[PDB]
């Protein structure tokens, strides 16, 4: 089997991407944030504290003839940005872009933190990291990908995120019309539960490539590109007026600037992030100070190849017995 679903930016800045997901019988369609940095499929629901729901579409398990309470199961998750959610668990039928999993753990939110409430466009998350990170207790649950794996034509999914435009998540096949040149594959460590790999280095604009190992994760659920402070300083030094602002919480730059590109290495290959991808607009409405799309990972404890990086490539998440990552230009 295969599946193919369009993923759409939630706003003009590509702050995140939502993908429609069918849950239950008859189908209830919710727009979920596909997150290769976590491993829980959770949704706003009829159980979510009413004051914490503000415009989201909810899953109502009592209206699904295929929903079953997973007795005794609870979940609770905290994300890198400090957001969180928790609740109980159902199993139900879940379909993505024509690909159907029966008995998928659907984690029903009883509580969500303010950042989730305040984002009316995201109805929940669909985790695509390794199932070892799944938070369901006392019986850990499998991701949608993990559950679908055996049935897929090939045990892979691909992320093709757009810049200021829709893109595609495919399951079970590689669309050879979706990228240019060849796909370069690189090793993955699953030891932290992430799609963790090592970039071979970087360049700033038309500058010479610096060969240096950068360990990090491929994370579709993170907006920006988070890299070591040395690398990030080297980038923003090429932007007149750019500075790191403690008060804003990162590098800012004059909105009148033309940003240079940023290249990262995948083995011997090179992915080029155009300068415009690194512009996340005024820090506050009407400001002439703009927020940068490349930020320091210092104090995160890991480097994160988030959407800013991933949207510059066609990315293969290879879930073979030894997982790997593939990157192509597009």
Swiss-Prot record:
Q: What is this protein called?
A: Endothiapepsin
Supply the alphabetized keyword list: Aspartyl protease, Disulfide bond, Hydrolase, Protease, Signal, Zymogen
Q: Where is the active site?
A: 35, 199
The Peptidase A1 domain sits at 17-328
Q: Which GO terms describe its biological process?
A: proteolysis
Q: List the disulfide bonds.
A: 255-290
Domain of life per record: Eukaryota
List, in alphabetical order, the Gene Ontology terms for molecular function in this entry.
aspartic-type endopeptidase activity
Give EC number(s), comma-separated. Answer: 3.4.23.22
Spell out the family assignment given in the record's similarity comment: Belongs to the peptidase A1 family.
EC main group: hydrolase
Q: Which reaction does it catalyse?
A: Hydrolysis of proteins with specificity similar to that of pepsin A, prefers hydrophobic residues at P1 and P1', but does not cleave 14-Ala-|-Leu-15 in the B chain of insulin or Z-Glu-Tyr. Clots milk
């Amino acid at each position: 089997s295969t599946g193919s679903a369009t993923t759409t930016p939630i706003d003009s800045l590509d702050d995140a991407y939502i993908t429609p997901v069918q849950i239950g019988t008859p189908a209830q369609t919710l727009n979920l944030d596909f997150d290769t940095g976590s491993s829980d499929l959770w949704v706003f629901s009829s159980e979510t504290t009413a004051s914490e729901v503000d415009g989201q579409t909810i899953y109502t398990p009592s209206k699904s003839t295929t929903a079953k309470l997973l007795s005794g199961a609870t979940w609770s998750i905290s994300y890198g940005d400090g957001s969180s959610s928790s609740g109980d668990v159902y199993t139900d039928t879940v379909s993505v872009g024509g690909l159907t999993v029966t008995g998928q753990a659907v984690e029903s939110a009883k509580k969500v933190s303010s950042s989730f409430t305040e984002d009316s466009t995201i109805d929940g998350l669909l985790g695509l990291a390794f199932s070892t990170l799944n938070t369901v207790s006392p019986t850990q649950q499998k991701t949608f990908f993990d559950n679908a794996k055996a049935s897929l034509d090939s045990p892979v999914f691909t992320a093709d995120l757009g810049y200021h435009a829709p893109g595609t998540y495919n399951f079970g096949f590689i669309d050879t019309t979706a990228y240019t040149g060849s796909i370069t594959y690189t090793a993955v460590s699953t030891k932290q539960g992430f799609w963790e790999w090592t970039s071979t280095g970087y360049a700033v604009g038309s500058g010479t490539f610096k060969s240096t190992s950068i360990d990090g994760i491929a994370d579709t659920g993170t907006t920006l590109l988070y890299l070591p402070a040395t690398v990030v300083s080297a980038y923003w030094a090429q932007v007149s007026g750019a500075k790191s602002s403690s008060s804003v919480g990162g590098y800012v730059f004059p909105c009148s600037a033309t940003l240079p590109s940023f290249t990262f290495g995948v083995g011997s290959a090179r992915i080029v992030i155009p300068g415009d991808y690194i512009d996340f607009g005024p820090i506050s409405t009407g400001s002439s100070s703009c927020f940068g799309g490349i930020q320091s990972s210092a104090g995160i404890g890991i480097n994160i190849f988030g959407d800013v990086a991933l949207k510059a490539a066609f990315v293969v998440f290879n879930g073979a017995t030894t997982p790997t990552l593939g990157f192509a230009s597009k």
